[PDB]
Design a protein around this ligand. Sequence first.
Ligand SMILES: COC(=O)Nc1sc(C)nc1-c1ccccc1
Ligand SMILES: [Cl-]
Ligand SMILES: [Mg+2]
Ligand SMILES: [Mg+2]
Ligand SMILES: [Mg+2]
Ligand SMILES: [Mg+2]
Lengths: 194, 194
Amino acid sequence: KQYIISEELISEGKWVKLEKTTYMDPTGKTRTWESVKRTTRKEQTADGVAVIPVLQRTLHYECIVLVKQFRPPMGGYCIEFPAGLIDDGETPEAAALRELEEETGYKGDIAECSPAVCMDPGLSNCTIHIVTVTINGDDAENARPKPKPGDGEFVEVISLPKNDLLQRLDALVAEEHLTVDARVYSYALALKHA
Amino acid sequence: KQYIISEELISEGKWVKLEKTTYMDPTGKTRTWESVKRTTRKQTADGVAVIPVLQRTLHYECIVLVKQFRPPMGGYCIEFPAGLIDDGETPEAAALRELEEETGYKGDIAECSPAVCMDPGLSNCTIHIVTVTINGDDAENARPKPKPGDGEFVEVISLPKNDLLQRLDALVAEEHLTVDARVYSYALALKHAN
Ligand SMILES: COC(=O)Nc1sc(C)nc1-c1ccccc1
Ligand SMILES: [Cl-]
Ligand SMILES: [Mg+2]
Ligand SMILES: [Mg+2]
Ligand SMILES: [Mg+2]
Ligand SMILES: [Mg+2]
């Protein structure tokens, strides 16, 4: 029933634009929306990837490897899955493995890769692939992992046990000012509810 | 170490604005970020998203989701029921209200997250994730009455919690729909648990 009629640029930055979207509603009535998009999406099946990195080590409980960074839109520190935008021509799997190494130091192994999923579909067209990766923490490659940040990347690594993830996130939030990402919280909640 | 210095308005619509954020990187170098914010917040968070667990005896437990045309995406998305929190409303009450409006179900609060970020590399948007149970055997939930506010057009899709990820993958494969990243993350963790 519903479809897009037109998309009018309102303002274009280097990285993000705002558009006036005209669409058809299911009553047959024309309506508008204010929509955000990135300027950086070319032929990628999505803007970015987020990595669900399952650190596995003999005689350890499995950990979920998370990162903490300052996020200027938020004005504060956020705890997230490692993540970044997909380079032109790069596959979602390649991007996930690369970002994971860049941000954490760890060299992972692909487990699964989602379809393109929406970040905040009432606001933006932004999409990611959510890529599950296992990290063999018994491999010597992963023994003393060093982040390789890019220019202006400043990332702290936080590994938490999968079997207590929600409580451990709650304990970090109780301890300083900082926001947990909604995807991370959602995953931690499902681990409780299962 | 890192903090906002100033924000420069680039463009303000009625519902969304784009800013150029100036911040201090941890080395002491000043840097810029393009940031999106809503104009609507006053509030613990912009929105609520509801994880609704539909419980009927002698049936599988289901997670209740909604399907809606999303103008920023140009298409239909599958999402947790959700909406913005009214000035003076609690996140709990917003959750029960949105769940009823979008689904017709009357639910009980189970738990409520802190404010969690939606896409912190891009925006300041935050939500409370509110877990709610629905007693599907109660007379009030027998014939659930969905009350859409103006211009909302919402289909209800209930899926079994025990096979959620496979069911969502099937919908995507058959229906050309976008699943929400928080829905997908939750579905992933249901599979990854234990
Ligand atoms: C003509 O109306 C719009 O453009 N509305 C927009 S634009 C946006 C980015 N959000 C809305 C919105 C927010 C809360 C509840 C309903 C809608
Ligand atoms: Cl539950
Ligand atoms: Mg990143
Ligand atoms: Mg990166
Ligand atoms: Mg809604
Ligand atoms: Mg609503």
